Amino acid sequence: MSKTDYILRALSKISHKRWEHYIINRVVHTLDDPDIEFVCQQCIRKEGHLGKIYLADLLFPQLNLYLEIDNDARKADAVRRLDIVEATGFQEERIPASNITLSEVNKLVDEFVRLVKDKKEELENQGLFFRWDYDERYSAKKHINTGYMAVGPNSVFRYHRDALQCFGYRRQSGGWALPAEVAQSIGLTGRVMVWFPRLYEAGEWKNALSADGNKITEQSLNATRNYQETWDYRIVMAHSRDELNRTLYRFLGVFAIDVDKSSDEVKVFSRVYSRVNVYRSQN
Amino acid sequence: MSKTDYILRALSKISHKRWEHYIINRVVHTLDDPDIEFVCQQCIRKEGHLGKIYLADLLFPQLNLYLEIDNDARKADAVRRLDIVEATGFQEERIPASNITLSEVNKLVDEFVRLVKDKKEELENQGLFFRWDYDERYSAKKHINTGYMAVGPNSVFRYHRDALQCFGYRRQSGGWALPAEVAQSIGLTGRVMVWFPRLYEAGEWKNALSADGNKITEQSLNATRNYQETWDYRIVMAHSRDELNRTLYRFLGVFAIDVDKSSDEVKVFSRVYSRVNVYRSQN
């Protein structure tokens, strides 16, 4: 789907909520910068472990900013396809969709579009800002540039071959063991794999994700596939879906078996690191 | 329906056509002037007697400007509710919805929004520009100010009492005879009425409007209501409908019986004047 195709669907998909459509459409158009990513109607986890999902109306991946304008339909469904993103150290600006006039409302938008304008001066003054690159939407490139990978809007991957490239894949269905070299290089101590899990009942696994974002539970339905956990860390790239029901893999963080809580039938993994360095064979 | 309610439905009703929604929404927002009327998806007759209806995407009543971006669904239906407007001496600017990039497309919008910007400098320099007045959307006020009334977006009226006020109604179902005073005052010579016709089969009349806009045909179904035309001019304010199926009365022009072509059963009226002065008992 083309960038414009993307841009044109983004602005036009918000016709349910009339107030939201205005304010979204105003700001994006107002701003008139095609070097700036924006996401619409992205469900979200916010600061503090709450298990509560919020709907962010505008999110700018490349600045840690989202706009909120104050739904159980979407929230329940996105969760259902793990279409969530953890937006921590993400600035929240807000706009009230009640008890206000347009002349004030698009004053706020006028103010907020300055933020977006000004919070990009910093990232350009500090040489951290990298112009929106749509065609590398779901690739490694960003991550190899940065050298690390956090939970966020950025760490999403179309295919397995795309996340494994951040961990030395040169050539990857199911799981991939990092070579002991890279494992140690990126600063994980042990025996380490990337896991591409389903986080629901699927074939022979009834898996699950805590509301927290912080505990994976996995339960084998078939028992000939009960096993002993030999891995010290799992880097988890969970199966999830688009608004258009396409498969993406979301980086959930680096997890590790909780051994007391775990069993042969039912293992429990806790989240240990919410980011991870990425491996380039350098210096 | 509130102005904002209007403004917010206007921008948000265009989600069928993705290219159109962008360009509409860009320009209106881009322009950011609440002292400017705009209409969306207004079907239209254009220069030269063609009987061909076009869809104008943006129309600014208070400047004779509409934007077109290049449908049989709407066209057929609007006609069906006489939701047409004759836009003559109306400037046409155009934008191609095919074989173009966004960076160019919103260049055009950037240019076109200058026109809208600059074609309002004239009407302010020449003291003719009167800031958008939504709550008098369908009233007489405009017309009493101007002193005359043309076919156009402006000459539309919620109730009969609203058009008859332009012709001396002080207090009006069916037809209203202008007093001989006003008839002569506004410069029509004869015996003159305002007609509020249905322009289709309705109860005891199978009426019709030529594709031209220029000939009303009326045929009595009941025959005890065949009559001799005694009126010299009919000022016609035709029954029509909103996008939301509310009744409005559109000024079609000043018409007169074509006597050769007419009959007892079936009278034919031709359009003689496409505007009309309006009566104030002055000087």
Numbering used by the authors:
A (entry chain C), B (entry chain C): 1 to 70, 77 to 177, 182 to 293
Task: Provide the publication's sentences verbatim.
PvuRts1I is a modification-dependent endonuclease with high selectivity for 5-hydroxymethyl­cytosine over 5-methylcytosine and cytosine. PvuRts1I family enzymes are classified as bacterial type IV modification-dependent restriction endonucleases and they are known to play an important role in defence against phage infection. In contrast, most enzymes of the PvuRts1I family selectively bind to 5-hmC and 5-glucosylated methylcytosine (5-gmC) with high specificity over both 5-mC and cytosine, and cleave substrate DNA at a fixed distance from the modified cytosine. The structure consists of two domains: a novel SRA-like domain that recognizes 5-hmC and an unusual nuclease domain that has not previously been curated by the NCBI Conserved Domain Database.
The PvuRts1I crystals diffracted to 2.9 Å resolution and phases were obtained by the single-wavelength anomalous dispersion (SAD) method. However, part of the putative active site (amino-acid residues 71–76) was not visible in the electron-density map and could not be modelled, and may be highly flexible in the absence of the DNA substrate. A search of the protein-structure database using DALI revealed that the overall structure of the N-terminal domain is similar to the very short patch repair (Vsr) endonuclease, with a root-mean-square deviation (r.m.s.d.) of 2.4 Å. Comparison with structures in the PDB using the DALI server revealed that the C-terminal DNA-binding domain of PvuRts1I is related to 5-mC/5-hmC binding modules, including the SRA domains of Arabidopsis SUVH5 (Z-score = 4.9; r.m.s.d. = 3.1 Å) and human UHRF1 (Z-score = 4.4; r.m.s.d. = 3.1 Å) and the SRA-like domain of another modification-dependent restriction endonuclease MspJI (Z-score = 4.2; r.m.s.d. = 3.2 Å). As for other 5-mC/5-hmC binding modules, the overall shape of the SRA-like domain of PvuRts1I resembles a saddle, with a concave surface at the open side of the β-barrel. Similarly, we speculate that PvuRts1I recognizes 5-hmC using this surface. The interaction interface between the two molecules is formed by helices α1 and α2 of each subunit, and involves hydrophobic interactions and hydrogen bonds. The buried surface area of the interface is approximately 812 Å2, which is clearly adequate to stabilize the dimer in solution. The recognition sequence of PvuRts1I is approximately 22 bp long and 74 Å in length, which fits well with the distance between the two recognition sites in the dimeric PvuRts1I assembly. The binding pocket of PvuRts1I is shallower and wider than that in SUVH5 and UHRF1.
